[PDB]
Paper text:
In this study, we identified four enzymes (two GH183 endo-d-arabinanases, GH172 exo-α-d-arabinofuranosidase, and GH116 exo-β-d-arabinofuranosidase) from Microbacterium arabinogalactanolyticum. These enzymes completely degraded the complex d-arabinan core structure of lipoarabinomannan and arabinogalactan in a concerted manner. Furthermore, through biochemical characterization using synthetic substrates and X-ray crystallography, we elucidated the mechanisms of substrate recognition and anomer-retaining hydrolysis for the α- and β-d-arabinofuranosidic bonds in both endo- and exo-mode reactions. We propose a d-arabinan-degrading pathway for Mi. arabinogalactanolyticum based on its gene cluster and four characterized enzymes.
The crystal structures of EndoMA1 were determined at resolutions of 1.60 and 1.80 Å for the apo and ligand complex forms, respectively. We focused on the complex structure because the apo and complex structures are nearly identical (Cα root mean square deviation (RMSD) < 0.27 Å for all chain pairs). Therefore, we performed experiments of multi-angle static light scattering and refractive index combined with SEC (SEC-MALS/RI) and small-angle X-ray scattering combined with SEC (SEC-SAXS) on EndoMA1 to clarify its quaternary structure in solution. The molar mass estimates of monomeric EndoMA1 calculated by the amino acid sequence and measured by SDS-PAGE were 53,678 Da and 52.4 kDa, respectively, suggesting that EndoMA1 formed a dimer in solution. The experimental SAXS profile (black open circle) and theoretical SAXS profile calculated from the dimeric crystal structure (red line) were in good agreement. In the crystal structure, the active site cleft of the catalytic domain of EndoMA1 adopts the shape of a typical endo-type enzyme (right). A Dali structural search showed that the catalytic domain of EndoMA1 was similar to the hypothetical protein BACOVA_04882, N-acetylgalactosamine deacetylase, and GH43 α-l-Araf-ases. The C-terminal putative CBM domain in EndoMA1 is conserved only in its closest homologs. EndoMA1 and EndoMA2, two new GH family endo-d-arabinanases with signal sequences, depolymerize mycobacterial lipoarabinomannan and arabinogalactan extracellularly.
Author numbering:
A (entry chain A), B (entry chain D): 2 to 480
The structure:
């Protein structure tokens, strides 16, 4: 939909230009999902789906026959400061230098093309990784699974065994093929959808110590929680996709993220069986074309909700953030309009929620040309101060946080990124020189006694034919 | 010298192809030194000298006017597992996205061109960073300092203040311009050289709690430790460079590393005043041309000695290892001859410590063409198995570790790296596909009942015109 996107892009976690350099460290050049859990020993384990190496070019999933295709990979993090990104400090490798596949797959189309992780947790000293055996893919959003299964690790993710616990899908419509786990007290709640993205969500529950025991599961039936999987009724209507559920102590509610039709949405509840509050837009397909996934980071605190989001054309995973209040409502949205430049193919005049820029400028539009999506802004010349800017309404005497992604031609010598009055008077800014990789800059400032500021990035072009590219600019209120 | 190098290359820590991605994370594209100390809170702080960003090309230090020249930068590590590299998890930045200069300099040639860190230590809640103010550079190994100073931080390296504590260089020949600190019980020993690389080492000591109080220093005079700095006498003869001193519990000895003339060497002592055992070669200038630095990692144990080495042409820092026994003697040297390919401009026949390769092979030779140095091997073809190898003598029944750096054409689909019998039958190998970045591969294997093996790397070339490059190959006994 054309709905505004409240969420802010924090970091590209995988693939080309990722700070993590997963491409160079582990041959993780393109991948998806980024499913996260706390391992119980002060780390976050992150699992990924179909993953390609060095020869991948994009756009989209899939690579040449030498693309080192793995069905899944697994990395760790110790990073407790997500505002500045999420560093990966370990991966499961084999050989050393190459992140390996942890759950094997036959890679025979129409039998088992792949194995895709769906949700993870730890209990005591064991790690558990739900996954689906994919028989074949169909059109976007449509695919057939053989079963949901569970792998486990007793060494912190270093080695993995596939358990004998399965939800078979003989008729295709089994309602727990793609799971999402959340612990509350002694119970693990187990959300489930069918294979693909067109059906509803159901819910089951299991004592935390009995996750692998099918006989200990009980299924919400409308009235109570009973023994038979066939008694499960939906708790959230179609369409639902891959899901993530988190119990948020700030708001004292469960939070659920999924792609529902076109957009990633969030719903909230105080009971896992519902009622579930209506969808709130997290990210729209207009701003983030061909987005999917949406998994909560286990260390979310204080209503500052970080999550991973996937996108088809760059086929890589992004760390995102949004803010909730104590009722689970999204507040303090990105105040920049058309933050990822995807909504227009031209600049405007900088007013009424448009971008403007000095000659020569434009919106580059090509598969995966953006930091995210297919659009980015640029400016380029060989004389003088050359900038891109937007007028944003703000609250008098409030404090704001500006982030955005940029890179320059190698010969760039002096640019700036920041906020200024509508008359050009700087409020707060940083200074960059030459920027190779897509790089995030970050400026915090007081609005002062004004109700509008101009957010901007630019380069001096006195020294030569110099350019700057810009994407995914966010202005959010602080607190 | 032409002496063999026992030391093994572990990882490129900074710059192009570095796993750490310092270039993309922090605009650290080219740098030197990598001076390390324990911060007393579970981390390793690492400081660097003159640092350049995105527009740096090399070879050598120095960059175009837009090179984002900083006199020094600082990064952190929490990595306890040095065999597979040293991950940096934090940097002092300003603006965010750019590692900043922590000790300011005037950048006025012949007044103060730069400020260069020398040695570091923590006592209680405070970090200290010794530095030299450089008035002007001379020919290689020759420069003039104004003084040696000490900066400090009370917040784990986040913010720095330059202290009033100084060793002025009035007569040009002050013996403590370029320091190395080592702590033993309650005492810091402060080794010192004159400016540049052609004089001797002296030694002082101070109570660890009184590092900033000049009055508290005592200076080894040949009989005891006295109050006057002009009473200090040499404990190690010229020529001495930058130095690193560690107390090694394993061997119960002080270990000292320095460039001494052409080669980096190590000396050992049970007392800081000496006597110092004779120099042992660490790395030779023939294998590692224009090498410098050599700083011990503070978490070394068990006789596994990790250190940082600098090299002019690539102008970046590498992690290195050697092994010592309990007398501080270097053992289990790299058995591969001409590990870095620097000793010849052509291939040999694979015997008597030479390399061999299939058609079409060569030694590529240009400034900074190597992973390290100017030389790397290549093999390239469009049919069949295409490999580079060397016959290496081994001990029957012993276990070996093979590491080496390689990368391929994008179109590579199936290569191997390992050890095999002289008749070509693999003993232990790994399988790579397409390798973008210079990437280290690692194989451990048992020699069996054999007196020699062939270490190799190669690619299958049936799928197209495909090439592999190779450098810095090491075979070391395990344990
Ligand atoms: Ca975009
Ligand atoms: Ca070399
Ligand atoms: Na995928
Ligand atoms: Na972080
Ligand atoms: Na330097
Ligand atoms: Na490591």
């Amino acid at each position: 939909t054309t709905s505004r996107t409240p969420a802010t892009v924090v970091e590209k976690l995988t693939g080309p230009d990722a700070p993590n350099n997963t491409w160079g460290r582990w041959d993780i050049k393109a991948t998806d999902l980024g499913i996260m859990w706390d391992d119980g020993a002060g780390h976050v384990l992150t699992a990924f789906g179909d993953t390609f190496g060095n020869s991948w070019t994009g756009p989209g999933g899939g690579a040449p026959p030498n693309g080192n295709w793995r069905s899944n990979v697994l990395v760790r993090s110790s990073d407790g400061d997500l505002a500045d990104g999420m560093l990966f400090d370990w991966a499961a490798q084999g050989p050393q230098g190459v992140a390996r596949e942890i759950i094997p797959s036959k890679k025979i189309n129409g039998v088992e093309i792949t194995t895709i992780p769906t949700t993870g947790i730890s209990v005591g000293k064991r790690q558990y990784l739900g996954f689906m055996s994919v028989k074949q893919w169909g059109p976007p959003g449509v695919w057939d699974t053989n079963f949901a299964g569970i792998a486990y690790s007793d060494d912190g993710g270093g080695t993995w065994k596939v358990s004998d616990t399965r939800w078979e899908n003989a008729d295709g419509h089994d309602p727990f093929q793609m799971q999402a786990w959340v612990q509350k007290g002694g119970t693990i709640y187990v959300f489930g959808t069918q294979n693909g993205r067109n059906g509803p969500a159901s819910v089951a529950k299991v004592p935390a110590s009995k996750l692998l025991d099918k006989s200990a599961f009980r299924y919400w039936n409308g009235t109570d929680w009973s023994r038979k999987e066939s008694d499960a009724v939906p708790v959230m209507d179609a369409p639902m996709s891959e899901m993530s559920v988190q119990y948020d102590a700030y708001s004292k509610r469960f939070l659920m993220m999924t792609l529902s039709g076109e957009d990633i949405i969030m719903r909230t509840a105080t009971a896992p069986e519902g009622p579930w509050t209506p969808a709130q837009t997290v990210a729209s397909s207009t701003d983030y074309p061909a987005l999917y996934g949406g998994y909560f980071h286990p260390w979310n605190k204080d209503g500052e909700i970080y999550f991973t989001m996937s996108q088809w054309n760059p086929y890589n995973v992004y760390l995102m953030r949004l803010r909730i209040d104590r009722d689970g409502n999204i507040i303090d949205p990105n105040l920049v309009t058309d933050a990822s430049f995807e909504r227009s193919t031209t600049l405007g005049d900088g007013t009424n929620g448009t971008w403007a820029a000095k000659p020569n400028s434009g919106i580059d539009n090509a598969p995966a040309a953006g930091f995210t999506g297919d659009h980015r802004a640029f400016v380029r010349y060989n004389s003088g101060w050359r900038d891109i800017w937007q007028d944003v309404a703000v609250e008098r005497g409030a404090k704001y946080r500006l982030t955005g992604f940029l890179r320059t031609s190698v010969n760039s010598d002096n640019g700036f990124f920041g906020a200024r009055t509508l008359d050009g008077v700087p409020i707060g800014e940083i200074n960059f020189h030459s920027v190779g990789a897509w790089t995030r800059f970050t400026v915090e400032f007081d609005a002062g006694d004004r109700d509008a500021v101009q957010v901007f990035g630019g380069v001096w072009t006195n020294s030569g034919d110099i350019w700057m590219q810009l994407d995914d600019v966010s202005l959010t209120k602080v607190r």
